[PDB]
A paper describes a structure:
To bias hits toward allosteric binding, we soaked compounds into hGALK1 co-crystals with galactose and T2 occupying the active site. Additionally, this crystal system is biased for the detection of fragments binding to nonorthosteric sites of hGALK1 outside of the ATP and galactose pockets. hGALK1 crystals were each soaked with an individual fragment from the DSi-Poised library at a millimolar concentration. Several fragments occupy a hotspot distal from the active site ATP/galactose pockets, on the opposite face of the protein. This hotspot has not been described for any member of the GHMP kinase family and as such represents a novel pocket of unknown significance. The hotspot is a hydrophobic pocket shielded from bulk solvent by the β7−β8 loop (Pro212–Leu218). The pocket is lined on one side by strands β8– β10 (Leu218–Thr223, Tyr339–Met343 and Gly350–Ala358) and on the other side by the loop preceding β6 (Gly193–Gly196) and strands β6 and β7 (His197–Asp202 and Thr208–Val211). Fragments binding in this hotspot pocket can be classified into upper (fragments 3–6, green sticks in Figure 2C–D) and lower (fragments 7–10, blue sticks in Figure 2C,D) clusters, according to whether they extend above or below the β7−β8 loop. Fragments from the upper cluster consist of an aromatic ring separated by an amide, ester, or urea linker from another ring, which is usually aromatic (inset). One of the two constituent rings occupy the center of the pocket, stabilized by hydrophobic interactions with several residues, including Tyr300 and Phe303, which are displaced inward to do so. The linker of each fragment hydrogen bonds with residues of the β7−β8 loop and the remaining, heterocyclic, ring is more surface exposed and interacts with the side chains of Pro216 and Gln382.
GALK1 is a small molecule kinase of the GHMP kinase family, which catalyzes the MgATP-dependent phosphorylation of the C-1 hydroxyl of α-d-galactose to yield Gal-1-P in the Leloir pathway. In classic galactosemia, GALT enzymatic deficiency causes the accumulation of Gal-1-P, the product of the enzyme galactokinase 1 (GALK1; EC 2.7.1.6) upstream of GALT in the Leloir pathway. Here, we determined crystal structures of hGALK1 bound with reported ATP-competitive inhibitors of the spiro-benzoxazole series, to reveal their binding mode in the active site.
Author numbering: 2 to 334, 338 to 392
The structure:
């Protein structure tokens, strides 16, 4: 049908071949870092909240080798990457720092190099490949940040923590792609484990690895194959408004705010205000309940909090789009379905029975106005290394 298979052995082989042809020698190491599906807990991470993502078999691979000349040489073979496919630059120094610009895909590699905390960092040659659909809502940018970071650790081991590394990747996203993201996508790309979701507490940075084994249960990802303008533009506006709802209430972070409060603080902030917040906490409490639900094997409560998630994202947070609303209507003929990631396009996430996947993909395709692409996703490992 329209099911893209991951083909990860091929993705590594692709990268190795292209490296031999481009640089005239076999690459000395491989790394990978996954993209992600957020099962529930949307627009909670920057509100010091809870999220429940899993890592995908869709990943970004770097194969490469240290250089002696203190410069970086990159080739990407990702169809979708903006021109040129290649970029070279000297390492940053105290005097001269990397700058974002053209092409954009390189800015993610540049950002991570610029903020890498350990030394001495040598130059390197690398091929970048990704099966993560570029800008399609499954954290292609976080997978490339964390794949870069994982490569730099092989060049110059950091003696650091998982949060410090997520924070570097996150800073590359802020400074070099101008995207003021939370920590979710980096965190899951670092910490995912095969057969688990990851409950992340973005206040404490405590992490729980939640078994997601049962073969009766499947996660269908549907790419709408739209990105609307409002995406780039509205994400920071939402963030900014969330800081205002906490500006008053005297709550550093919304996490520190319960729903009895927002109901009783109605008309100490905007109606745009009360909205957005109803969502967040709706969504924090749904993710806590969702986590608990997933431990008990209680799919219907989780899958009903998931449909409850979508409704709140669509009506209260106003970061759905008709394409998302229709992809779920279609699927929700499944425990549940909802947008995942930032919204304004990208993917839905459908929790269906494995038996019913062949028919879901008949129906979604035949009842979606747009072009649907499908991933049938096992919960995957995070950042990995293979010495070659
Ligand atoms: O234009 C946008 C809109 C904002 C979201 C977004 C981008 C682009 C970056 C420039 C070229 C394609 C689109 N790329 C990503 N992520 C990404 N680009 C990669 C290149 C190679 C390997 C893995 C990659 O992941 N995200
Ligand atoms: O659930 C909303 C999410 O949007 C993602 O795309 C962003 O990178 C995350 O940090 C988080 O804010």
């Amino acid at each position: 049908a329209a099911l893209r298979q991951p083909q990860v052995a091929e993705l590594l082989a692709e990268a190795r071949r292209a490296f031999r042809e481009e640089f005239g020698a076999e690459p000395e190491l491989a790394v990978s870092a996954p993209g992600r599906v957020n099962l529930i807990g949307e627009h909670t991470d920057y509100n010091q909240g809870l999220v429940l993502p899993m890592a995908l078999e869709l990943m970004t691979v770097l194969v490469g080798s240290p250089r002696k000349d203190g410069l970086v040489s990159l080739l990407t073979t990702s169809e979708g990457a903006d021109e040129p496919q290649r970029l070279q630059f000297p390492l940053p120094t105290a005097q001269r720092s990397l700058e974002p610009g053209t092409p954009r895909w390189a800015n993610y590699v540049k950002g991570v190099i610029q903020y890498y905390p350990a030394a001495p960092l040598p130059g390197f040659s690398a091929v970048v490949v990704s099966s993560v659909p570029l800008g399609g809502g499954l954290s292609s940018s976080a997978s490339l940040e964390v794949a870069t970071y994982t490569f730099l650790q092989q060049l110059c081991p950091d003696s650091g923590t998982i949060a410090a590394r997520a924070q570097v990747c996150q800073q590359a996203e802020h400074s070099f792609a101008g995207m003021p993201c939370g920590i979710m996508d980096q965190f899951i790309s670092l910490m995912g484990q095969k057969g688990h979701a990851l409950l992340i507490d973005c206040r404490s940075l405590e992490t729980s690895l939640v078994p997601l084994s049962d073969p009766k249960l499947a996660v269908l990802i549907t790419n709408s194959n739209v990105r609307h303008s409002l995406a780039s533009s509205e994400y920071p506006v939402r963030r900014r408004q969330c800081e205002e709802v906490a500006r008053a209430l005297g709550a550093a972070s919304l996490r520190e705010v319960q729903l009895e409060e927002l109901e009783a603080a109605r008309d100490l902030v905007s109606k745009e205000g009360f909205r957005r917040a109803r969502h967040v906490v709706g969504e924090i409490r749904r993710t806590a309940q969702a986590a608990a639900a997933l431990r008990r094997g209680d799919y219907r409560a989780f899958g009903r909090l998931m449909v409850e998630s979508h409704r709140s994202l669509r009506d209260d947070y106003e970061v759905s789009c008709p394409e998302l609303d229709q992809l779920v209507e279609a699927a929700l003929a499944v425990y549940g379905s909802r947008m995942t990631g930032g919204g304004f396009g990208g993917c839905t996430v459908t929790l269906l029975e494995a038996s019913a996947a062949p028919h879901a993909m008949r129906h979604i395709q035949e009842h979606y106005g747009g072009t649907a692409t499908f991933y049938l996703s096992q919960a995957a490992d995070g950042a990995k290394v293979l010495c070659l």
